[PDB]
Amino acid sequence: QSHDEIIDKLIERTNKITTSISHVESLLDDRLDPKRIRKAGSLRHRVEELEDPSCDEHEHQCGGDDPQCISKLFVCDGHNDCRNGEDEKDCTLPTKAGDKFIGDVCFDHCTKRRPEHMTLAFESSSIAAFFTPIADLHVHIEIESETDEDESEVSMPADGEYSFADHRLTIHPPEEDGLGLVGEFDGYNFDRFVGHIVHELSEEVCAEFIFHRKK
Amino acid sequence: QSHDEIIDKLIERTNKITTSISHVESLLDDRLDPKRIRKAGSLRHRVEELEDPSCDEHEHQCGGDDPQCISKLFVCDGHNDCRNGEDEKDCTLPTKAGDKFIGDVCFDHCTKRRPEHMTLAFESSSIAAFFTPIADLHVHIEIESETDEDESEVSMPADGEYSFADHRLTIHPPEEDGLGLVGEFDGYNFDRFVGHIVHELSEEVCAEFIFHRKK
Amino acid sequence: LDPRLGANAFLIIRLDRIIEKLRTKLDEAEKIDPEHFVSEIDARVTKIEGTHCEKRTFQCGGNEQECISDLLVCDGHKDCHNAHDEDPDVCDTSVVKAGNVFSGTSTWHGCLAREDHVTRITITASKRRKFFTARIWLRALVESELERHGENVTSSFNAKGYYNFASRRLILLPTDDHDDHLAVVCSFNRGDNERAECHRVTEATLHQCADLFVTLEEHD
Amino acid sequence: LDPRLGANAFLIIRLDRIIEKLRTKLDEAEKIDPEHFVSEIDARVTKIEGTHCEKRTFQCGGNEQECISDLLVCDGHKDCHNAHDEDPDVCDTSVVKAGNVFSGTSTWHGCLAREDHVTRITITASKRRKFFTARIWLRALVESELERHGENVTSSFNAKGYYNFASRRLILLPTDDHDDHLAVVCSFNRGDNERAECHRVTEATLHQCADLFVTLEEHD
Amino acid sequence: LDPRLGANAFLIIRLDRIIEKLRTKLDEAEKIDPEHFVSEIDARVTKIEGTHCEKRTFQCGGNEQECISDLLVCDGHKDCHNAHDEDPDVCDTSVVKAGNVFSGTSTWHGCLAREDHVTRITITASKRRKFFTARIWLRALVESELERHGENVTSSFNAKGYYNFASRRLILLPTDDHDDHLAVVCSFNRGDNERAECHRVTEATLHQCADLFVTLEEHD
Amino acid sequence: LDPRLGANAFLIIRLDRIIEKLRTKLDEAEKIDPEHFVSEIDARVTKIEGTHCEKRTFQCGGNEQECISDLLVCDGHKDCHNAHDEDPDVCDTSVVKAGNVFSGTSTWHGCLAREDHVTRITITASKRRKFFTARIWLRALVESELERHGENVTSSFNAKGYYNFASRRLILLPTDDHDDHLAVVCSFNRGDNERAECHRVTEATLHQCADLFVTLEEHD
Amino acid sequence: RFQYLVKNQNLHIDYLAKKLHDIEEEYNKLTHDVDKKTIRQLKARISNLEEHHCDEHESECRGDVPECIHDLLFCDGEKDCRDGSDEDPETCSLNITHVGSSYTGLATWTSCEDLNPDHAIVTITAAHRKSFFPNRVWLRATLSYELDEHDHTVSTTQLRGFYNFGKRELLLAPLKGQSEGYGVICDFNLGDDDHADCKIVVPSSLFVCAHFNAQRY
Amino acid sequence: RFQYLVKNQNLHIDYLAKKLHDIEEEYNKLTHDVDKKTIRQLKARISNLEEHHCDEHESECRGDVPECIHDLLFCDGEKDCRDGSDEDPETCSLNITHVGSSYTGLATWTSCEDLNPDHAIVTITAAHRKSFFPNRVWLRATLSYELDEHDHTVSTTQLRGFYNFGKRELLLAPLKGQSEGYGVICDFNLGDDDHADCKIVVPSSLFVCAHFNAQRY
């Protein structure tokens, strides 16, 4: 009631606040939830795609409340070319060695197997020390086919690069049938990208697969 | 990175949990929120009033999942008369010395002043050591009237008791006009009670005021 | 750094007492169930309002209100517009699952000079004719731990009866036990399958000899 | 600098005891009020000097001295040259606000063989005719905790009367209580509205049966 | 108990760093506003969908869609069925409150060999005819910190114009400054009153000489 | 008891280093596999003893020895008395699963003045006719990182061929690459599906131009 | 040598995390709180069984004091209730009389047509509130009820009427001159603006031809 | 002598409480999160401007893979979409075709009647789903639109039709033999089950007589 009850009151009150504190720290973290950011930013992108092009054909938009067009050859090159800096603050390579991506077909008018799925394994990836804007990749495109007369499996290897310029990895044609893969990343996602199979020469789309990062 | 970064990781994690902990302690407190209890229990009462009487005229219901009727003369008497104990676990006197209650009229067919308000000040309150079921009170009923021919003020004093038996304080007639006050408490509230002004002899209701505890 | 690390413990030890005390709260919380209480009031009130259907009829969903004979109460064929007369929750067999035990105090006010004693209704068996689901036929054991000349005695008897989903009524009649026992009757009108309101009655008039509020006994 | 800072505390702890003891002094100070005491003497003396106005008349400001009939004492119309006969402080209704309670010892020397007991005058109600403000009409309850044959008894009665601003007199007559009670009469001549000088008297002769000095009871 | 109390401090000191770091988060949180961002997309998209009303007309509430001439845009009389053409938020005078300053980069692509420079539109004055509210008439100062032969120069001029609620357009023409300056034109289509999309143009053809995205400067 | 408990730790800390060092041993243990090594010797020796069946025939279980034509090697129909010619382990498709990569040093001694370089056989695709299982048809990529005039070059070519369970032979011929590449031929006679013995040869005579021992590359 | 005290501390924590998850888990396996919209309906249902002093043509203030004021005085712009409850938004909500508003339930007829329980739908077709007389929101609606559950014929009578803020009752009658069909009375005394106790009446005597408890949408 | 260290500790705390309240306060003065029902409407509005491959008579699965299946196959009991999105509840919600359902907006006519923008109300009067043919929820409704904004006359035509799960479109036409009025098409491609893009058409050619963006209630 003195050196006993007046000491356990200046304690049960220390906690009664330590709660109200972390309680807010939560409500705050809820509005900074990065998962919410990308998810929303991702939505923004979809819109940016509908709007008339913000910059010329071969230029990179730096966004922000004050736009600036710089050459795509400058995105992630080591030099601060944009006032805001976008051209240099987001240079993380998504498809890096070891990573695997599973694609679910949804429109196939050309592949030789018209497969249900299509795995995309990234073997190696190296960036040239003097040209940061492009990372070169080596990939194995795996496929599990199965008909009546037989049952085949495939793992065609192909070279390819990833351009931080527009988050688009181009995978050079594996087989000599003029068919290559071109997946362009969301910008904020990186665990799912639409993969278009095209005729390199023409650039004709003839197969769409939604690729998910196999985690 | 060793005795520096491995020590601030076994710390920023201690908190990362101390949050998830108090986070739940909150969700729990939210379902035990006493303010919610009474508020709901209060609702229960309103219903108990519509249902046929649970016990005889002069008996107290102990409630619970197994009901038992005991004499009202046993509620808060010092002896454990009910199996569950209700008759003895809720014996807190609401209107105790010092307390003031403001009543808002809403139906007045008898008071001499047909006043807009009506203050109820509790001067003294004492309980007889051997008869706990009834607490005796001394109250001053204040009134602020004001007409054309004059402007009166009143502070009539009256005796009265509070029966834990049914949370009903009876205030004996102040003036010799056979008019007394009878307010019955919610059971769970205690900061608001409906005050009926009646003719003691008859027990006729002729004035209703909602009394709020002036806090 | 022995201090910042050896002290970061007096910080953790706290969470240990906290997390523990927190266990006690989660125990208190399970006792004060809202979605349950509310249901008690709903049923409590609906009892006053009274189903808008004549005796022996089943009232359907508060939206598409309509009366159904309890011979279809829960027969397997969609009879109400909202099919509320086949809604699983209405026909939970578990209310009177064999092995369920209900106890409570039986206050007498009608046909016996008995002191407030306890009754213990326990379901013995329960058949459900596959060609007539509207009723759960069942056998049960009724015991009454009451005090008589001297010490504690036990007046028990075997019973047979049925459970009606429509009214959530459980009727238990004596198995011809020629010792003249009062048939027990329970209604599970309380918003749950745990508690029921019972009465001891004469099989003939159904006149109420006593009030009995039972509760399903916990199995732990 | 652990010393100059850890010691600058033994300096602050001091102010803590000081500030506290200082609270006690502010309590002692409220009891010895000067502007109040002085007023007691003023009134005390004016009582000896005596208003220079004939009975039933109101004396105005010590500068523009002049007599006014208490039928205007405080009627709402400026009657004195200095208007002191409408000065708020003269007509503070609060002196006899309903609910005010005055207690004190009633020493008897005239019409009763009573032992020095206490009287408790408490204002029940108070009307003030809007067309005649010069008077506060009021009802009150007079109680007298006195000892008689055996133990403590209470001789009380209801009273009706009025308060006159001009003379700060409060007259309370019995509400025809045919038990023959002595009308009480108080004057608030003491420089404040808290204390008053009273006497029990016969309504007829106004002969003084007893002396009673009351004080307004604190509400805390 | 020097230990449990002197240690209960190392517990409080924690909350001190916490509460502080928490301040930083509340600062980060104010930068990432959702209800605002969403609005940017709404407007961003509505811009693509395009109001279903012909040029110079005001589209009303997405529920009771209907076209109104901007001569009523915000005139004081309920013209739309939903009255959205008088909704306060549509006619916030503050968008172009006198004293507001907008800056931003002006990229040139049409009528001048200028290097990407900055323009600074600042509202000088703003009258609003009480008998014709549909428009905010205003004067403003346009400055352009651009580099020429040598160092930093400043090509500024005074302008007069108006703000139209209906289209949230701000038109600023030169005050006959015979130095031939390109009239500026801003639209506040961005979901807020802080940012606007502008263009420098020829008052005649309204041909777009340059793109300019301004932002209201903070006053702290 | 601070000592017996605070010391019982120096006892546990030990198990921590132990358990860790123990991890290293479990790593060393995975490298020295017995049931595998033994198999290497079995096959190694059986190679000397030589299957008692004529070329292009499959030897069955060491108990019920008997010869089967590799056109049935693994066709789906029980052909041997012990059915060893359908035993799963004989027809593990995985030996040459598409995506498998084999590397190793190619020492030349027959048709090219090449310095000991490395070859990298990697299976591109693999079909298996459902009406003729006895063979795995496959396409593959053969690369040879060899040094020529100056620095590191790469002489690669696409190949087509088949895998025969009976002999665990993998034959890879050039896809008509008119650059004249030596067909590669591997036998997985080593007791496992990881290692194989290869030779570069002329598709005509099958004359051996070089020795190449490959190993399946780890995928981690 | 150094992590000897840390390697386990992180464990004592990895511990708490579990003893807690095994709690947050046992939590979810517990009935959640009830939507306030439910309690509201109870307080309503209940408040409807309790005794009420307001005499016909009068409804009680929504305040804390159950004062009774005449129906003709709710939502008229002048504080008539002691506390002004007759004018606060929660009372004068037009939520009910909004154009297009539609309430339906299962009509079970007890007095004017063979028809076996069928679906009734009273939906608002237009409604204006005369600027100078706010007490009433004059409106027009349609009452439709299925005829033959098999070929799906359905009767659709046009109605006229108003909505009483006081009684919180929707009162509609046939337009006069169209096969003289039925009328309909809906009480929204159910607690919120989406549930009502409707009854198809005979315009003439307001006599209950059939009853149907309705919901909104 | 003893509280000399406590009397202030409680102060250091009474302190934090304030430095925090002055935070929780500056918090509320910040825009709250947006109701998911809003984002949903955006993702919708947006998704409607994006290019879509499904050819007339086909609608895309609601799954993550934008696969196109024929309209005649949604909600028929057999997983037709790669992932089964054509059969999950969020797709086959009857929420729209519920009896009594009513949608209204402001109809602004562009081709078949003098009428100046007036209120349009398409409300569902009855609707059954043939047990063996789930793809369609056959129904009946009423289309009402105000005539004279002054005397409040209002047209009420009865309709017949169904609701297409695929296109998420409500298609109603006049019953045939009642003044040959109009029909109505409502697309609920707006994201949720309460907003729709309705257009009053001429039954015969589905030609747009007028358009009105509707909401439910």
Ligand SMILES: [Ca+2]
């Ligand atoms: Ca750059």
Ligand SMILES: [Ca+2]
């Ligand atoms: Ca007791």
Ligand SMILES: [Ca+2]
């Ligand atoms: Ca049935």
Ligand SMILES: [Ca+2]
């Ligand atoms: Ca006067």
Ligand SMILES: [Ca+2]
């Ligand atoms: Ca207007």
Ligand SMILES: [Ca+2]
């Ligand atoms: Ca075989």
Ligand SMILES: [Ca+2]
């Ligand atoms: Ca009013």
Ligand SMILES: [Ca+2]
């Ligand atoms: Ca009938």
Ligand SMILES: [Ca+2]
């Ligand atoms: Ca399907």
Ligand SMILES: [Ca+2]
């Ligand atoms: Ca027109």
Ligand SMILES: [Zn+2]
């Ligand atoms: Zn018995």
Ligand SMILES: [Zn+2]
């Ligand atoms: Zn006396």
Ligand SMILES: [Zn+2]
């Ligand atoms: Zn300029």
Ligand SMILES: [Zn+2]
């Ligand atoms: Zn080679």
